[PDB]
Amino acid sequence: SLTLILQLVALFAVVAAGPLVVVLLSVRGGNL
Amino acid sequence: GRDQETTGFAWWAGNARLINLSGKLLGAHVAHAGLIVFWAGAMNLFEVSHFVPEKPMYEQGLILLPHIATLGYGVGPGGEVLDTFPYFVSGVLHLISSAVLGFGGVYHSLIGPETLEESYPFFGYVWKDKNKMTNILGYHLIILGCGAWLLVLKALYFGGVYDTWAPGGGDVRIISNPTTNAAIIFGYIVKSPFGGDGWIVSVDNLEDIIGGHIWIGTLCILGGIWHIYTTPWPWARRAFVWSGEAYLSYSLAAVSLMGFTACCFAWFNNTAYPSEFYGPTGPEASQAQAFTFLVRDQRLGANVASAQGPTGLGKYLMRSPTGEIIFGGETMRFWDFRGPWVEPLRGPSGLDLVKLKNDIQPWQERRAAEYMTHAPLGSLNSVGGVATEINAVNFVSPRSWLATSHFCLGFFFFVGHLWHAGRARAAAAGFEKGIDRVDEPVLSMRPLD
């Protein structure tokens, strides 16, 4: 369903956000 | 960030690394406040998105919408919801404010100054600076007094709050003439916490609640000014320990007491926690079952005054140990329950016989049947009823959820208070890292323990 698909998209986005920030700070310089 | 070698703290105690970093500690605090406001807004938006208008709030697993409804937004007579847009606005305002608080917290955690003492002496502090500690405490006391006065202003001039004791089954009411009498206000704080007394949980009218909030706001503002303009006295300086961990332990004890008290408010109080929004209390549900089985057998022609059970006490009516006419059965233990649907039926001697014979209102009957069927009993997978009931209904009372969660939180914060008070004493005394192995005190003591 469209509701379940949008919920899954939002869930994947929020779950991947923080790890992406950490990965980007690891590969882009540091200070983490 | 910092490592263990330069701080002496492992990663699982890494927040201790910023005990003496004022700017980073401030950043952690502001980010955390953003987290709290984020949960408030997100949970409020979740509850309004899942809110269904025809069912009552307590049947829908909601804990914040009852709070805003008790404040008196979007509800009418009988606790009926008229509009959920105020709830949506509350959620949106919290969720937006959480972004600003999160930005401030992330800024002060990452790129803000580590210590505020050099460039920002107004905000800079050391934990042993008792004058600055009392200044910060005074600022926060002033803010808390202003919050209590905000509640007072909402109750008096900005639409009032929901009175469950209003005639006809409760309504949103303007509180005129709050109880400002000091004897009445501080009697609550000096009451016993046991049955029939209930300490401050037994506050039963909005006049008493708002008068107590006037007192709390004025006292908080006056004490805030007092702490801004005073320094702790020598007896206090000898009695206390002056360090960040010690202050944290004091706050942990205070909020543990507050969590236990909030547990008891959620479980027992039906005035500040109206049953229209939170469901019946446990005593309310038991008394409602007794009242419903009284009125049913009265409609079946049985005399509910001369009917005695197997023990001989009385199936429907009996006496409290002080002589009041009360409902029979095990709900005798809840004989001190007071609710808006039963207090019209009570005369000076208790449950009035002629009132129970002739003066029963249909709204009282409906609330009693509803509260009997929605007792605060359920499983943690949300199967309503006693442990032996099958998986038919999906219900756990918000009062049950709040009471269980907040007893757990109060207990853990008591334990954390013990941990931090002990560690603060040991660190001030200088043996929080262990026995010196060269100046061991017990080896200098007389034997035989």
Binding site: - | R238, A239, F240, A429, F431
Partner: protein
Amino acid sequence: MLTLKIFVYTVVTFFVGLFIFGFLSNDPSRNPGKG
């Protein structure tokens, strides 16, 4: 019963006052630590 209540109130008040003023009596100084 009132005599018993008066006596028990006196006893409890005495022990609680001892507790309170004992921890008020410079208790953080009562340790073998250095500093």
